[PDB]
Nucleic acid binder design. Structure first.
Ligand SMILES: [Mg+2]
Ligand SMILES: [Mg+2]
Ligand SMILES: [Mg+2]
Ligand SMILES: [Mg+2]
Ligand SMILES: [Mg+2]
Ligand SMILES: [Mg+2]
Ligand SMILES: [Mg+2]
Ligand SMILES: [Mg+2]
Ligand SMILES: [Mg+2]
Ligand SMILES: [Mg+2]
Ligand SMILES: [Mg+2]
Ligand SMILES: [Mg+2]
Ligand SMILES: [Mg+2]
Ligand SMILES: [Mg+2]
Ligand SMILES: [Mg+2]
Ligand SMILES: [Mg+2]
Ligand SMILES: [Mg+2]
Ligand SMILES: [Mg+2]
Ligand SMILES: [Mg+2]
Ligand SMILES: [Mg+2]
Ligand SMILES: [Mg+2]
Ligand SMILES: [Mg+2]
Ligand SMILES: [Mg+2]
Ligand SMILES: [Mg+2]
Ligand SMILES: [Mg+2]
Ligand SMILES: [Mg+2]
Ligand SMILES: [Mg+2]
Ligand SMILES: [Mg+2]
Ligand SMILES: [Mg+2]
Ligand SMILES: [Mg+2]
Ligand SMILES: [Mg+2]
Ligand SMILES: [Mg+2]
Ligand SMILES: [Mg+2]
Ligand SMILES: [Mg+2]
Ligand SMILES: [Mg+2]
Ligand SMILES: [Mg+2]
Ligand SMILES: [Mg+2]
Ligand SMILES: [Mg+2]
Ligand SMILES: [Mg+2]
Ligand SMILES: [Mg+2]
Ligand SMILES: [Mg+2]
Lengths: 10, 52, 76, 77, 64, 51
RNA sequence: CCAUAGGUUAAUGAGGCGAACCGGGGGAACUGAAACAUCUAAGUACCCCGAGGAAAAGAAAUCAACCGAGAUUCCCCCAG
RNA sequence: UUUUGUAUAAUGGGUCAGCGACUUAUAUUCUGUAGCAAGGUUAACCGAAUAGGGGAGCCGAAGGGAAACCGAGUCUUAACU
RNA sequence: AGGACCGAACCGACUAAUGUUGAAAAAUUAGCGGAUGACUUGUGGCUGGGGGUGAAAGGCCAAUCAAACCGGGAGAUAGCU
RNA sequence: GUUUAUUAAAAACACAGCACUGUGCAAACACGAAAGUGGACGUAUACGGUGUGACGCCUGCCCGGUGCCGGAAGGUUAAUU
RNA sequence: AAUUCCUUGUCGGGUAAGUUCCGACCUGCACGAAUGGCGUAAUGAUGGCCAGGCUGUCUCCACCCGAGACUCAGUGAAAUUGAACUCGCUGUGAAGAUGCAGUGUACCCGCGGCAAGACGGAAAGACCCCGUGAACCUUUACUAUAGCUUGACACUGAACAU
RNA sequence: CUUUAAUGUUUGAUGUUCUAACGUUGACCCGUAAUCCGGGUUGCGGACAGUGUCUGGUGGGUAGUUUGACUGGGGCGGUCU
RNA sequence: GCUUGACUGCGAGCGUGACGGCGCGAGCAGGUGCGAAAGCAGGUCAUAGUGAUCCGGUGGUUCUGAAUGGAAGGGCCAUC
């Protein structure tokens, strides 16, 4: 599994 | 709409009636008109009544 | 805004033109006010709709002091 | 459990209605009561779990007659 | 399984001799007084089902 | 035999068009559906009785 | 106080397992309705009890219609 | 593949081989075809049994009307040219 | 005497670096806090899923938690790709 | 002291203290179709709930609204008859 | 001011220079008294600010010691990948070109390096929108319901007083 | 007829005096090596309490759902015949 | 001034709508009104003043009436 990387913008 | 619908019932006792409207503020007196009655096949006087 | 409203078009105008053969009762033109007036063998409806009162050819003509336009039916 | 020892009445299931007829499952239980019945033959009081409808049949049928049918089913007292 | 007829449509359409379906006109239930007599008189007789809706009616009525 | 190559003339769509209800597996509206309106056999009133 | 409850023996019987079918006690929701409450799904899934090789039902307080039929069960129609 | 529009710097695929998606049942309509024909055809079931029997039924040859009713007419209406 | 002080074991996990297809699916190194107590730990036991437990963060309940896992309804449904 | 095991240890939570309120013990309350159990083998100097949060100085005005408590004359009003 | 939008409010202190900090002002956009107010020693891996000490934090890096990186021998992955004979520029073009047009440049092939580009790799986008999607949660949304409460009847009988 | 007063006729409303249903998580005895249960004795309460059916009220305590579209993205505004 | 044609049954032939539908209509039948009559009148100069179906209510109706006679209920007409 993984943990949705939070390098996303807004 | 504040004018209310009324029914005009034939005096011949056939039970046929017409429907129309009348102004309640004025003309309190009942409405009398000579209209054709299909049951007796003649023009007779129709008298105002209450729709119910 | 407080605008942007209209009604569906009522499809007025001339339905049968000059020289066309029509059956009795067919409406020739639907109008607002007497743009055309009823002539021979032509009736006028309660909304000034001119209808044919007999079979025949549609003819347009201009007569009278008011320089009006009249529609008549020549029933052969 | 909630079972009448005379009539055998047991809980039954039904629906709660409403003005909109919505149906929700419910239970109907008998009007059971623990009563000490006087049996003349043994000159004793025997306690029974009976419904209110069961009480009516005891007067009509007699205390001895009803107990005889229960013995046919077979149970403790 | 057998096809089930739409029971709602079966109570309003009857098959005719040449395969058509007849129905009563609408707009004649409870606001009819304000309607002109000519309008009410024309709505009283039975009417024919239009050609556009013929396919839909036959689908709802497979056994009749 | 649809969906069996280009030459068959019914390939890659099976005669169902492009992404409609008819192209979905088990897709399509029920009998009498008029796009959302109550159908003609419900616009019109009931009449008569069965003898 | 008799008794009764209770107690001790002795005889029998039952215990558990097992596919489906059967009867009974309980009993959904997703879904469909292009939403969603009535409704549908469905007395289905599932749980519980009991039985048999089948089970259940069964010998009219039944239907018919002024003529009549004559327990129950099952099949095809009647009929979408 | 999806689009008004993709060399597109839009999606898909490292490659090969194998497998992998419009079927089935019932009912209904239409077309084609075959049979019979104002008739056509049986179902369950029986049956040495794909035969034969079984026409129980079903469709069609008459419709109109809400219906009672009438009928090559019928309904509408007091009545319809 | 003390939920007292400094400080090992023990326990915690504040900062930084490394590592980030790890030595390790959360650690190591150097520091850090508590360290006789509301401490810590062993072995058993009890509380079960709309329920538990929670000095309370929607936390935790077998690497899974704004409703665990397994099987069933079930080929749920998917006007979407 | 406790906390988001695995990006947040904090001013968050807890906390002693304070106040309100419920609760007379077959207590209130809670877990349980029920029995029963916890509360508690306790008895208002007790227990539960709520908010506040050592200590110091203090905590003013509004009961209309919404709740809660008390009253019951009148108005209205279910099953039942 | 964890509360002040205007706003870096105004004044004072600190600095060479202070939108932060400290002290006041009150003009409280939009503090306020147990959803407590104001103070408060001690405590705090608590937040902000200042000073001394201290230093490669920096001016501005230099050298050195180890472990890798590099070479040899042995063992021997991974994510990715339509196919490639895989240059620059300008222009064009599903509108930011290794692949089109024009033009320029370029012998064939490794090794050590740097990451500008290949809209590089990772993961059917978490933001936005949509579906007559899902779920939790809130309430004077709707419809119910457990529970609580009211009365009638039953379990449940007999005197007396108003 | 009104104001009514007395008088005759009927359901109820409380209060009380009861016990015999019912209650006793009062005492005592037995089952009995037993803080369960049952039976007995007695006391207290008592036609209540409590429970069943029906019924009014209350009820995010717990459920099942709804909560529109158009729109120079959406929301807001506006609009819907 | 006099009146109720703001008539009942119908309707050749057209118009406009995908449809549901909406609109126009001479003429015909029966009975009217105004005119001496020819004739005109099936509301208003015209084009807005509006809401389908289901369900329920009212009046009328020899249409129906689950054995038969009724009735309930349903149907039709008028109408809410
Ligand atoms: Mg093609
Ligand atoms: Mg398509
Ligand atoms: Mg649905
Ligand atoms: Mg056997
Ligand atoms: Mg590409
Ligand atoms: Mg790929
Ligand atoms: Mg054929
Ligand atoms: Mg045969
Ligand atoms: Mg026959
Ligand atoms: Mg005819
Ligand atoms: Mg200490
Ligand atoms: Mg220490
Ligand atoms: Mg310390
Ligand atoms: Mg976990
Ligand atoms: Mg859930
Ligand atoms: Mg599962
Ligand atoms: Mg299912
Ligand atoms: Mg699936
Ligand atoms: Mg963490
Ligand atoms: Mg911890
Ligand atoms: Mg941390
Ligand atoms: Mg606090
Ligand atoms: Mg007040
Ligand atoms: Mg108040
Ligand atoms: Mg500011
Ligand atoms: Mg300054
Ligand atoms: Mg300051
Ligand atoms: Mg405040
Ligand atoms: Mg306060
Ligand atoms: Mg500090
Ligand atoms: Mg210093
Ligand atoms: Mg590989
Ligand atoms: Mg290249
Ligand atoms: Mg370019
Ligand atoms: Mg290289
Ligand atoms: Mg680099
Ligand atoms: Mg998504
Ligand atoms: Mg939407
Ligand atoms: Mg649902
Ligand atoms: Mg929208
Ligand atoms: Mg006029």
């Amino acid at each position: 599994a993984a943990a949705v990387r939070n390098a996303r913008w807004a | 709409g504040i004018r209310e619908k009324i029914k005009l019932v034939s005096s011949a006792g056939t039970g046929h009636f017409y429907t129309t409207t009348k102004n309640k503020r004025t003309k309190p007196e009942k409405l009398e008109l000579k209209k054709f009655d299909p049951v007796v096949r003649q023009h007779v006087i129709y008298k105002e009544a209450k729709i119910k | 805004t407080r605008n942007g409203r209209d009604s569906e078009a009522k499809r007025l105008g001339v339905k049968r033109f000059g020289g066309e053969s029509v059956l009795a009762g067919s409406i020739i033109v639907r109008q607002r006010g007497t743009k055309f007036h009823a002539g021979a063998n032509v009736g006028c409806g309660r909304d000034h709709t001119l209808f044919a009162k007999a079979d025949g050819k549609v003819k347009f003509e201009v007569k009278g002091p008011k320089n009006r336009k009249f529609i008549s039916i020549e029933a052969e | 459990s909630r079972v009448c020892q005379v009539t055998g009445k047991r809980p039954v299931t039904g629906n709660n209605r409403s003005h909109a007829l919505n149906a929700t499952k419910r239970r109907f239980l008998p009007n059971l009561h623990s009563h000490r019945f006087w049996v003349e033959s043994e000159k004793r009081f025997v306690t029974l779990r009976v419904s209110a409808k069961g009480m009516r049949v005891i007067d009509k049928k007699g205390i001895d007659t009803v107990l005889a049918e229960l013995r046919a089913r077979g149970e403790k007292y | 399984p057998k096809i089930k007829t739409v029971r709602g449509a079966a109570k309003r359409f009857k098959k005719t001799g040449k395969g058509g379906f007849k129905h009563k006109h609408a707009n004649l239930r409870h606001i009819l007084t304000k309607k002109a007599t000519k309008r009410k008189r024309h709505l009283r007789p039975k009417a024919m089902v239009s050609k556009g809706d013929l396919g839909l009616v036959i689908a709802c009525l497979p056994y009749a | 035999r649809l969906g069996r190559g280009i030459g068959s003339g019914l390939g890659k769509t099976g005669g169902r068009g492009h992404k409609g209800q008819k192209s979905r597996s088990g897709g399509g509206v029920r009998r009498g559906f008029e796009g959302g309106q109550m159908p003609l056999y419900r616009r019109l009133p009931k009449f008569g009785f069965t003898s």
